[PDB]
Amino acid sequence: SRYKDNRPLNILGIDISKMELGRYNLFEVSIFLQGSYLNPFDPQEIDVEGIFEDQYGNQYRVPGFFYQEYKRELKNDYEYLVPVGDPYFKIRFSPINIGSYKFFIKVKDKTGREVSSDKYTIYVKESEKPGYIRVSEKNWRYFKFDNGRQFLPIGANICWATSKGTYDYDVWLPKCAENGGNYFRVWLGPSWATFALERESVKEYDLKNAWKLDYVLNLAEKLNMYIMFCFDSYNELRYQKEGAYPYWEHTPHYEKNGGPLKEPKDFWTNNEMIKYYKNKLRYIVARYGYSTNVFAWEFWNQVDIISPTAFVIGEVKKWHEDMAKYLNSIDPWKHLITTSFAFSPGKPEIDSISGLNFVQTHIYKSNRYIDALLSLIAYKEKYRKPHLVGEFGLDAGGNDLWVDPNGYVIHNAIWTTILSGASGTAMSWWWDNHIHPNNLYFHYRALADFVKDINFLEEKFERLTNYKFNVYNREIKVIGLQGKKYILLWLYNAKEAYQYKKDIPNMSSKFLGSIELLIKPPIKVIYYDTYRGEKIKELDLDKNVIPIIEFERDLAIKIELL
Numbered sequence: 001s002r003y004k005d006n007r008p009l010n011i012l013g014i015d016i017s018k019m020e021l022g023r024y025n026l027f028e029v030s031i032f033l034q035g036s037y038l039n040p041f042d043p044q045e046i047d048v049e050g051i052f053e054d055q056y057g058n059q060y061r062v063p064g065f066f067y068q069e070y071k072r073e074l075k076n077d078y079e080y081l082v083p084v085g086d087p088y089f090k091i092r093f094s095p096i097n098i099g100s101y102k103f104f105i106k107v108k109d110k111t112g113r114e115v116s117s118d119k120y121t122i123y124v125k126e127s128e129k130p131g132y133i134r135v136s137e138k139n140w141r142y143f144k145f146d147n148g149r150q151f152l153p154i155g156a157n158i159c160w161a162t163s164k165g166t167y168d169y170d171v172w173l174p175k176c177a178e179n180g181g182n183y184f185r186v187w188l189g190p191s192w193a194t195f196a197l198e199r200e201s202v203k204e205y206d207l208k209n210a211w212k213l214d215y216v217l218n219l220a221e222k223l224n225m226y227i228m229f230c231f232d233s234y235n236e237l238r239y240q241k242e243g244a245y246p247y248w249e250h251t252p253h254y255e256k257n258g259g260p261l262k263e264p265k266d267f268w269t270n271n272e273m274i275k276y277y278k279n280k281l282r283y284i285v286a287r288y289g290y291s292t293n294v295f296a297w298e299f300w301n302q303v304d305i306i307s308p309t310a311f312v313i314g315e316v317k318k319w320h321e322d323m324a325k326y327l328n329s330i331d332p333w334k335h336l337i338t339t340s341f342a343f344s345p346g347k348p349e350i351d352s353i354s355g356l357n358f359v360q361t362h363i364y365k366s367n368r369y370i371d372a373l374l375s376l377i378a379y380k381e382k383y384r385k386p387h388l389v390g391e392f393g394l395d396a397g398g399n400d401l402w403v404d405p406n407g408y409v410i411h412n413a414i415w416t417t418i419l420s421g422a423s424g425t426a427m428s429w430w431w432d433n434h435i436h437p438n439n440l441y442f443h444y445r446a447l448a449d450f451v452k453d454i455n456f457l458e459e460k461f462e463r464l465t466n467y468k469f470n471v472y473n474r475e476i477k478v479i480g481l482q483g484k485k486y487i488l489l490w491l492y493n494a495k496e497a498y499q500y501k502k503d504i505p506n507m508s509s510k511f512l513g514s515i516e517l518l519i520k521p522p523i524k525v526i527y528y529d530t531y532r533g534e535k536i537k538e539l540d541l542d543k544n545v546i547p548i549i550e551f552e553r554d555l556a557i558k559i560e561l562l
């Protein structure tokens with residue numbers, strides 16, 4: 001209770017960031033107050049709310065949150081945050097409609113006393129921002145922004161920093177964004193994570209780490225990147241003797257460390273833990289919900305590999321149902337909600353919950369992973385909602401780093417997933433020790449430039465079905481999509497795609513073979529170098545047999561039905 005107060009409830013001062021702002025931009029209110037509360041993160045101790053109303057009758061009830069300002073510095077190799085001023089409360093709002101808004105502040109503390117501000121008026125002008133990310137109503141396999149443009153996530157996991165903290169994101173994010181990236185994922189647990197809110201406690205949240213997450217979210221805003229926030233990771237509920245980077249013995253949830261839980265199984269049903277978890281959801285909505293750069297709320301990283309002593313499917317399912325309902329109810333902007341599993345096929349009992357707006361796959365497989373990705377993407381079409389391959393690698397043990405310095409594994413996965421019908425690219429691990437130092441971003445740039453012009457929401461793509469390969473030289477396979485106006489092909493050499501020793505292909509002319517498709521000419525055929533990210537050749541065709549030019553590892557082909 002380092003932040004307690006014991007004074008009569010009074011608003012002392014209010015600062016407003018701007019009186020005029022653009023659609024979907026941040027409107028921030030700072031509130032100085034006194035009151036009676038033992039825990040500023042607990043709404044039963046103090047409840048700050050901002051009540052906003054547009055000129056179309058829509059009302060928004062925005063929870064407020066406790067805030068400490070910091071000034072960051074880099075002490076050679078670690079980030080250091082200096083507190084600036086006393087902590088205070090904030091409200092963060094984002095307007096969906098333009099025009100005028102009225103708002104006021106309401107505060108209630110543990111005594112039952114309630115105080116409020118007068119009403120203030122702000123004006124909202126049109127902006128360039130596309131809005132929040134939703135599931136597409138036109139094609140449930142894909143995401144859209146509120147303004148109807150597609151959101152096709154291209155990026156990687158970038159889940160935590162080194163000791164350099166936000167200074168690492170200063171480096172990684174601009175590199176990702178200038179190479180076609182618009183997506184990453186961050187972890188808000190376990191307590192060692194850069195953005196861990198439950199660092200020393202599950203009752204009070206870490207104001208330094210929350211400030212770091214502010215900073216990174218603001219950088220994503222400047223770079224037009226969209227973030228999945230992963231609230232908790234399985235390690236928190238996994239015993240040391242179970243391996244796999246366990247953390248139960250160190251986690252604040254455990255009674256040994258001051259928490260309410262005698263064992264991780266009790267996480268799902270312990271009344272005190274559920275209360276604190278809802279307080280955390282409220283804090284996250286309060287502090288970050290305004291942002292259109294929050295792509296999704298993700299409850300768990302791999303909840304199926306918590307301790308087997310703790311995984312009771314019926315309880316984990318009910319907890320996801322109840323928390324998704326609660327989170328959706330308090331989130332004024334109704335961000336997408338998801339969860340994840342280490343088991344690649346997932347858990348249908350949980351994945352089919354209506355409150356989870358999209359499903360995910362994690363897969364670390366070294367042999368024939370192209371076929372595995374295709375099979376999992378076909379399988380999870382049964383849920384009739386988008387599918388994100390949220391984690392991908394060769395090997396949970398990290399063999400990728402030395403067996404595949406050129407990123408061919410990442411390459412294979414991002415082309416396979418996009419041209420198999422997934423909502424976006426397979427999302428690689430190893431951002432810090434592999435993608436960045438080996439400068440693998442060019443793979444994303446090539447893929448982004450191939451798909452940028454394609455409107456996946458209107459193409460009605462289906463997996464390519466009725467093709468005939470005529471190739472004698474080699475064993476070529478194809479992953480493809482057939483749409484109303486485009487056919488997109490990724491061809492790969494089955495005997496080269498899984499070998500990682502050779503240099504990046506630096507190809508060339510010759511005829512290799514052909515593929516004929518169930519389509520009607522005339523057509524324009526574009527051959528695309530997937531490593532340089534360039535058109536190689538264009539060809540106008542009068543019939544349905546597509547020549548395949550020579551290529552070393554893989555080749556993309558874009559066919560336009562004229």
Ligand SMILES: OC[C@H]1O[C@@H](O[C@H]2[C@H](O)[C@H](O)[C@H](O[C@H]3[C@H](O)[C@H](O)[C@H](O[C@H]4[C@H](O)[C@H](O)[C@H](O)O[C@@H]4CO)O[C@@H]3CO)O[C@@H]2CO)[C@@H](O)[C@@H](O)[C@@H]1O
Nearest residue numbers: 192233235244245301302342362364391395396397398429
């Ligand atoms: O160094 C900072 C921080 O690292 C922590 O360990 C990390 C580890 O370095 C590595 O990045 C690991 O990546 C996992 C990650 O958990 C993914 O969600 C996913 O998972 C796997 C899981 O970890 C097991 O290996 C499991 O058997 O297989 C899962 C995949 O199916 O895969 C990634 C690659 O393995 O993440 C851990 C943390 O989870 C800690 O060492 C910490 O002390 C340290 O500060």
Ligand SMILES: OC[C@H]1O[C@@H](O)[C@@H](O)[C@@H](O)[C@@H]1O
Nearest residue numbers: 162164167168169171172436
């Ligand atoms: O910023 C990402 C990485 O960049 C490198 O050049 C070093 O400065 C690392 O300390 C840092 O973690």
